[PDB]
Design a binder for this molecule. Structure first.
Ligand SMILES: [Cl-]
Ligand SMILES: [Cl-]
Ligand SMILES: [Cl-]
Ligand SMILES: [Cl-]
Lengths: 10, 10, 10, 10
């Protein structure tokens, strides 16, 4: 999973 | 939360 | 992407 | 966020 919430888990 | 893994909830 | 966070983007 | 797209962040 690529995510941003202020920065990979994919 | 913005998230992509292939598509906001933040 | 299949996701649930409360419901396809894949 | 729960997500599968082939595997929690919620
Ligand atoms: Cl996909
Ligand atoms: Cl794609
Ligand atoms: Cl949908
Ligand atoms: Cl779709």
């Amino acid at each position: 999973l690529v995510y941003f919430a202020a920065x990979l888990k994919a």
